[PDB]
């Protein structure tokens, strides 16, 4: 944004976009996973308790 | 007098401020391309060398 004007930033800034939103979604998703696991060993504590 | 394409003149420039307004405002180029940094925004830029 300091060294490209918009009609040209923006062919660039779309490629930061979609590699970070890729990268943000799987750091979520894999996030899901492991509290679905956590969530697993809270009901078996739960139980133990 | 230029030099011939084969012998290219090259020139550094460095510890110096620029005004590339007085370049490309100017009306005598046929042609100013620039990659990678716009016309524009190159005024307001800094570089090393």
Redesign the interface.
């Known amino acids: 944004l300091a060294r490209l004007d918009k009609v040209e930033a923006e062919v660039q800034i779309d490629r930061l976009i979609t590699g970070r939103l890729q990268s943000l979604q799987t750091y979520v998703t894999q996030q899901l996973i492991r509290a679905a696991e956590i969530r697993a060993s809270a009901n078996l504590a739960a139980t133990k308790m | 007098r230029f030099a011939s394409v084969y012998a290219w003149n090259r020139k550094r420039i460095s510890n110096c401020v620029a005004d590339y307004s007085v370049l490309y405002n100017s009306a005598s180029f046929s042609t100013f391309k620039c990659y ?3 016309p ?2 190159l005024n ?2 800094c570089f090393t060398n």
Do not use: E, I
């Open positions: 990678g940094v716009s524009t925004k307001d830029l």
